[PDB]
Amino acid sequence: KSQIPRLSAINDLHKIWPTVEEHGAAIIESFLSLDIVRRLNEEVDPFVKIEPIPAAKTKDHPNHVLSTTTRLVNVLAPISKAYREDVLNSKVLHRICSDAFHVYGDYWVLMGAVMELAPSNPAQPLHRDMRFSHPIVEYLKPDAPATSINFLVALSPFTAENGATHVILGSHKWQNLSNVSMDATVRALMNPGDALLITDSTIHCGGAETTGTETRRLLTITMGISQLTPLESNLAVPRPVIESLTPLAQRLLGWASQRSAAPRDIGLLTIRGNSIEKTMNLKAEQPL
Amino acid sequence: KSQIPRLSAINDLHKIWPTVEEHGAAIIESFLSLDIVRRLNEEVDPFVKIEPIPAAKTKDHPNHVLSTTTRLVNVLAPISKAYREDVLNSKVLHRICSDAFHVYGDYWVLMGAVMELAPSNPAQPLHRDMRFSHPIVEYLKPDAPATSINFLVALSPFTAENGATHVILGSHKWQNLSNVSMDATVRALMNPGDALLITDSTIHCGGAETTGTETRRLLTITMGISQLTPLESNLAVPRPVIESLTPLAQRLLGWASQRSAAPRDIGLLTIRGNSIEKTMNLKAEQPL
Ligand SMILES: COc1ccc(C[C@H]2C(=O)Nc3ccccc3C(=O)N2C)cc1
Ligand SMILES: COc1ccc(C[C@H]2C(=O)Nc3ccccc3C(=O)N2C)cc1
Ligand SMILES: O=C(O)CCC(=O)C(=O)O
Ligand SMILES: O=C(O)CCC(=O)C(=O)O
Ligand code: NI
Ligand code: NI
């Protein structure tokens, strides 16, 4: 059977979204440079080491779904200069997202998280994303363009034996889910900096860590239309951090008003006809 | 033909949502007391007098749809004690919204606005709400439960001659929109404090002001599932105002995390497994 299409972030930029739209998945080789991966890893390191189990009893909003051997840390902007500067302003990411979401309008970050899987982390069941947070998405017509997409960026090697993600190609177009089987999957074998791009309808799962020694880490960036509420909030991010960002990054984090693609769009998160950023006199690109 | 069903806010509470679900519209008599209407009117008065045309050239997010004789002012919490206290904690509103949105989960305010129509304001074309802000809603399956509803609360008399709202009963279930005609409408004749309740699929329009003397005013409260982004932002509302609110009102204004109805819900606007309100040590019901 056919493998996940592989594309250049440098040369094949216009081909990436059409490839995902057709096949449900694509690998973007060198989506992030090794320099960015390195800085990103350094910056998030301590925060993933301190992270408790997904369903820690201390938590207000425990995640009862992820395995106990998963450490997920979101709201990365205050943690990581590399994230808030380099990845939030990624030319490749923005071309793909504008290609993907043009029918709907503005898009933003639903969740940017670093996920680290401990050695011996088990395979997840095959699933579609968004079903534990956005029940609305299940009620969309089958030809509705994808309302969110997920960049699964390797921050360490993804191998068959260490739990590289499985996808079922074409499954983003499936309505009958009885052919759902691990027999139908292929793997996203990836180097650090490569990214697996899927839609919210692509059937996929984390793989089984079978070595007992390897710790796999990824940066998962769920980008979605600005009409859907983010899984994560940047409301508590300090204003000096927000004001150091580009206007585009501020929009991505919910620190700007948003626009739909309707011809006479009336906007989202507006304040009596004016934007958040105008109203609050929000500055941009102020060095820290 | 049949008129809009009329219901008591006091006695018929459990019947209101079932009535709207069936007919697409209902009138809730005395939804707000005359005392609340009075205080609300006093408090918003100056702000509607200062409001420029919907598409004022000074505006970041001009509304090119509403007539030039419309004054709409949203983000009412900092303007009105009556709004932020009495209407945001309305027992009737919350019973209806929990009835309406239980399949999806938490709901919040998409927009709370005072609309005032000048004398001679023309009839709006027949329409469904949400199409200039949430293109996603058009892609929902026809049996998808309503994802937003709109309380059109009379703040002055609604009469046939002064432009009382038109609705087409049953039109929330229409898929073919070729029977759309003013011939198919009935009017929401209402006293101050009464409310017309419609869904996002109910076909309706503002009426023609034919007297040349009467100024009609309403409070429009679009309540929607917390998975959809509000038309308006409360990000710039001062913290002392927010901290004077009940926890429920804070949630309604986007100053709290939110939950979906998925069995193992992972939540919306969360911060690494904890809520906004826990993270920011947000107080509630602190008198000003
Ligand atoms: C163990 O079995 C699972 C079943 C389903 C899921 C889906 C997933 C989701 O819908 N969104 C994301 C996206 C990025 C990172 C994590 C998640 C996340 O928490 N869940 C639950 C995860 C695990
Ligand atoms: C003049 O013709 C019109 C055509 C359509 C509309 C729809 C409406 C909407 O979708 N949502 C609301 C809801 C509450 C108050 C105002 C509005 C608002 O601005 N529009 C555009 C209004 C006017
Ligand atoms: O671990 C992976 O590679 C996939 C994780 C995933 O799909 C999820 O948690 O939603
Ligand atoms: O003026 C009215 O009564 C209805 C207004 C309305 O439906 C709208 O502006 O969306
Ligand atoms: Ni997943
Ligand atoms: Ni309307």
Curated annotation (Swiss-Prot), chains A, B:
Its EC number is 1.14.11.81. The chain holds residues 116 to 403 of 416 of the full protein. GO terms for biological process: biosynthetic process. Fe cation binds at H127, D129, H204. It catalyses: (-)-4'-methoxycyclopeptine + 2-oxoglutarate + O2 = (Z)-4'-methoxydehydrocyclopeptine + succinate + CO2 + H2O; (Z)-4'-methoxydehydrocyclopeptine + 2-oxoglutarate + O2 = (-)-4'-methoxycyclopenine + succinate + CO2; (-)-cyclopeptine + 2-oxoglutarate + O2 = (Z)-dehydrocyclopeptine + succinate + CO2 + H2O; (Z)-dehydrocyclopeptine + 2-oxoglutarate + O2 = (-)-cyclopenine + succinate + CO2. One of its GO terms (molecular function) is metal ion binding. This is Iron/alpha-ketoglutarate-dependent dioxygenase asqJ. It is an enzyme of class 1 (oxidoreductase). The keyword Metal-binding applies. The lineage of its organism: Eukaryota, Fungi, Dikarya, Ascomycota, Pezizomycotina. Homodimer.
